[PDB]
Write an enzyme that holds these catalytic residues in place. Structure first.
Site, short mmCIF file in Angstrom:
data_model
loop_
_atom_site.label_atom_id
_atom_site.label_comp_id
_atom_site.label_asym_id
_atom_site.label_seq_id
_atom_site.Cartn_x
_atom_site.Cartn_y
_atom_site.Cartn_z
N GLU B 165 -31.73 65.24 -44.27
CA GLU B 165 -31.76 65.69 -45.69
C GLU B 165 -31.78 67.21 -45.79
O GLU B 165 -32.74 67.79 -46.27
CB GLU B 165 -33.02 65.18 -46.40
CG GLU B 165 -33.19 63.67 -46.36
CD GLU B 165 -34.47 63.20 -47.04
OE1 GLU B 165 -35.21 64.08 -47.53
OE2 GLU B 165 -34.72 61.97 -47.07
N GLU B 354 -32.79 55.80 -43.66
CA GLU B 354 -34.05 55.51 -44.41
C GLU B 354 -33.74 54.72 -45.68
O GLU B 354 -32.83 55.13 -46.42
CB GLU B 354 -34.78 56.79 -44.82
CG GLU B 354 -35.23 57.69 -43.67
CD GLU B 354 -35.92 58.99 -44.08
OE1 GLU B 354 -36.28 59.15 -45.27
OE2 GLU B 354 -36.07 59.87 -43.20
#
Lengths: 449, 449, 449
Positions: B165, B354
């Site tokens: 991210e 995730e």
């Protein structure tokens, strides 16, 4: 289905000098690179040594009386160069000669056939101080010692081995330095490999000059190298492994050449060596058989980060039972190898100088070693040995490694290949069940698989 | 209707290094921008820190034993740069390599397939003192640390992530300054975004040079951005969002370009800057898969209030059940996204690095965590994961965030994404009912929705 | 399909001395441990004894005339030590010798082949006062008595059995104490097992020192021990049962060793006993055949509740027809055992000292015993006896237990294994239909099964 080996098929069991003999400084024996390597902390497991070992040197009478009780037709052993020449050249130590003379004459008188190995790793430490096997002069001195043995024991001993596993000597002993003499340089490792094979060549040339009525050969460390997958990258990675490992010694003997695909791997790292053309014609010298030592097989994969270009295929080897050494069990890996030697080198006479296994042995409440796994191992691999003979192979001999539990080099006495249990505190022999199995296998000349 | 996933489908659970490891100053670990940010009042909820966390550094044997008890087929974790290079570059800390080397070898020797992230937000504080990810040099130093990891753990680890991210790291860490390193400047926030992507590009280029037999990708924060209404201003507003958010990191990596509609909104605020064209052909470097992290979906309207010309749609959002984070639950948002990644970017291989949810957990009178809402959340989202695979998507992996209750950054320990409860006073694990659910879902390879 | 045994196959029937002879204090016969054990309340059913029994001692003429009427090719019987030495050692009782000398000569003269057992449980009670088989001196006295029998009967008697079922003597007589001499101590029970096997050895050793032109062996109580389920615990439980039971005697005699898995079980209760190594070489002394006594088979399960580690699998046994003894009928359970002896002890010569069954016999209104079930039992077990010979087993002899109805030890006369009925009030012999069947089986050399 009961299986039976050829009626002339010589059954035997093998040992080495340093691994059993002991008496490391008795009757004028010179110090070896193994005496030296063993007496230094960090080399041998638990600080063990070959100082005493099985103490065969004094207890050989007991041993032969066991060897005959099992009824082996051939006992393969090694002569300690440092008992014959303490200094490696010059002053003969008659006490040493007279030990091995006496030993061989007890064997011939107990109806057992001698099978000598001339070099089983115990180079006199004096020559190591003048460069050892790196010094080409050693190859001459090895011939001198060879000469003296042949004069005395030439005719009366039928089966001769020049070297034991020169593959390991150069790799472990001179590159990885976990075996004696503990050196760690790649270039030296290859110059020793050549100088070993050359010394084999000189010993066969002398053997013929002197005209000894007996058969000579060389005992090589050999496995089969399977590819991880039927892919162009893996099959090639495996061909390279076998070439570096066993073929590096098979081709110079037998084909009078070094393997190319291996040579190209050395020169890609900036190592080339001008082999004198006349040495390779001296190494290739005809020999009466090829002998080898097999225990396991390798399963190689592609690896373009391992500087070798390849590595073991840990995904595949974790499907086998593994022996106490951590080597896979794979009996059909012997067959394929025997067929590879038969194919690629013109159906030669083959010998097996050494097969056998190490499992954890105990003496039970019955005072016996019931090592069913060793026996299971043995008959599994001997079924594939037979299979090969049936499919044409000229496999004349099988020698079981080993007769006694011994000094397993850098593993110390933590590993048992013996069919005869030896307590290293009392030096008491208890013939294992794998020993009583083998006795019957020799008697019947086979077993019901 | 019973769902079953492809027979080769890998089930996994995920954690980060700082969020679970603890031991923030042990065995020569250097200080991280998160150690530094966490130690300062006003940055973490209730003055929480990582310092100890789940203490996974010491208790990993216990954690594997649980991972195997649930029987995950892949564990996704993060390597601490500051354990490997305490000063970002130079002196290798062999203690830190040996931890992760050991950890990986315990996974391979249990059931479990390793999945390594290389940067999960814990930049060595030293490189932050020379500008951090603003200083382009850091992009080289990342490659140096990448190199050392690949040499050790290259081919024995199948799935690799370069970054986690980078969308958050730049936005929260370098513009809003509510994550580490706490910087609040818009220009800097874009210069970092680039520098991060570039570093990915350098690691993949180095990955190929070394020729590691494994798959590499990048783990991006990604939601779907729905328009408030089916109207020309609201469809455009939503396209511009996504483009500022996710597409800003999707289009450089998979199309070798930056999104135009977003770049136009930067320049309308008086900022351009010439990206070297050669960098974005180093970013675009072909990758074996795209990975992403999803939890929720965004509903954007047109807004001439807000300097971005758009805003969230407040009370479309106030029609959904909300997680403990305040994020909407909308399972069908995951399907549409998977289809948007498939349609655009050329039917790539997809991984979910995730997915998960945070609900207020309690240990009931029965000493158990009955988190029916996390289970409900899960199966809802996993039905739309399956639905995508049926309609043609190449979704190879699902990793459940998270295996353990962990440090949720600026929210502290106040939010629990764990299957496996962790008491942060005693460090006692209590596998959640979502844990036991997931175990069966792995075993059956699915569930009856 | 009509089955026919080998042409050289010796058909026989068997009795014991105490069970048939009577005359328990006549012509100078010493008291035995069975005289003693029989005279005490609580030991024998209904307070029976073997004081009279069949009274064979007087009525042997009648019995031989019956034996020849049926036309058995061999009669296996026992010599009462106490009739030879009333005091175990010292003064010879010539009256006893002359009985058996006379008996044997009436058998040879009626064209029946003698088969003498030397110990069938009747240890002189004087030796039991000096400790019995627990005193090792007994093993020397056994050899003295064995010496006097060989001098007289050596050459002219072709088949010799040293002991009958030492397994039962030690187990039932010296641990459970429900046989004579009634002792109940585990340690003693093993010391006697060894001493018994030792005495067998000494008798063979003496049998070879004198070179008697006849074949010696040992008669052991043997069943097959099946595992309750083909599972690792239950296979292993069964192996331990057979080891404690039969193998405890098979291995010493044929392998010169005690079974390990059994010896371990004994040390785990805190009992190890140092067998002198030389005794086990004396026990192993080569023998011409192995004889055994089978009736039924066992079905053993794993049981940690039983301190043995196993127990009978009643759940299985309650599916068979049962004899009057309660023992299962399972014919194939002979086949499997004959194969087990054949496989595991080097295809020896095998005899069957005893096989037969006990069923409730009546004399009908026709004055005949139509015991169809005993004839069924017999022909079912003899079909599997045959089957094994076809599949390569060296089964030379079959002896039917028993010729007469007799004294079945602790059960008293309440059990009838005869093929000749004996009224124990009148002593009148009525050949059973099983007796008439066997007569035709001997003549035809088989039967259509």
């Amino acid at each position: 289905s009961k299986i039976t080996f050829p009626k002339d098929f010589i059954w035997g069991s093998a040992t080495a000098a340093y691994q059993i003999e002991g008496a490391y400084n008795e009757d004028g024996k010179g110090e070896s690179i193994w005496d030296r390597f063993s007496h230094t902390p960090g080399n041998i497991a638990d600080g063990h040594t070959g100082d005493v070992a099985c103490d065969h040197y004094h207890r050989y009478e007991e041993d032969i009386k066991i060897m005959k009780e099992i009824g082996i037709k051939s006992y393969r052993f090694s002569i300690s160069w440092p008992r014959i020449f303490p200094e490696g050249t010059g002053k003969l130590n008659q006490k040493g000669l007279d030990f091995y003379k006496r030993l061989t004459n007890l064997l011939l008188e107990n109806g057992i056939m001698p099978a000598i190995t001339l070099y089983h790793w115990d180079l006199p430490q004096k020559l190591q101080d003048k460069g050892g096997w790196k010094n080409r002069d050693t190859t001459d001195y090895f011939t001198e010692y060879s000469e003296v043995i042949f004069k005395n024991l030439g005719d009366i001993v039928p089966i001769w081995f020049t070297h034991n596993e020169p593959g390991v000597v150069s790799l472990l002993g001179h590159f990885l330095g976990i075996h004696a003499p503990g050196i760690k340089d790649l270039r030296t490792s290859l110059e020793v490999s050549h100088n070993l094979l050359l010394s084999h060549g000189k010993a066969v040339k002398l053997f013929r000059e002197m005209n000894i009525d007996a058969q000579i050969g060389i005992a090589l460390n050999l496995s089969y190298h399977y590819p991880a997958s039927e892919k162009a990258e893996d099959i090639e990675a495996a061909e390279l492994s076998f070439s570096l490992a066993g073929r590096w010694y098979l081709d110079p003997v037998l084909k009078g050449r070094y393997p190319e695909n291996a040579l190209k791997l050395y020169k890609k790292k900036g190592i080339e060596l001008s082999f004198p053309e006349d040495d390779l014609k001296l190494i290739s010298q005809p020999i009466d058989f090829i002998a080898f030592n097999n225990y396991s097989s390798e399963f190689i994969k592609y690896d373009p980060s391992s500087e070798s270009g390849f590595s073991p295929a840990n995904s595949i080897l974790e499907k086998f039972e593994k022996t106490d050494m951590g080597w896979i069990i794979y009996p059909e890996g012997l067959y394929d190898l025997l067929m590879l030697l038969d194919r690629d080198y013109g159906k030669p006479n083959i010998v097996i100088s050494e097969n056998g296994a190490a499992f954890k042995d105990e003496i039970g409440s019955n005072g016996k070693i019931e090592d069913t796994k060793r026996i299971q191992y043995l008959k599994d691999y001997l079924t594939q040995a037979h299979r090969a003979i049936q499919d044409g192979v000229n496999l004349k001999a099988y020698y079981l490694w080993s007769l006694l539990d011994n000094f397993e080099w850098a593993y110390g006495y933590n590993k048992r290949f013996g069919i005869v249990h030896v307590n290293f505190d009392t030096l008491e022999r208890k013939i294992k069940d794998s020993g009583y199995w083998y006795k019957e296998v020799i008697k019947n000349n086979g077993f019901l698989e």
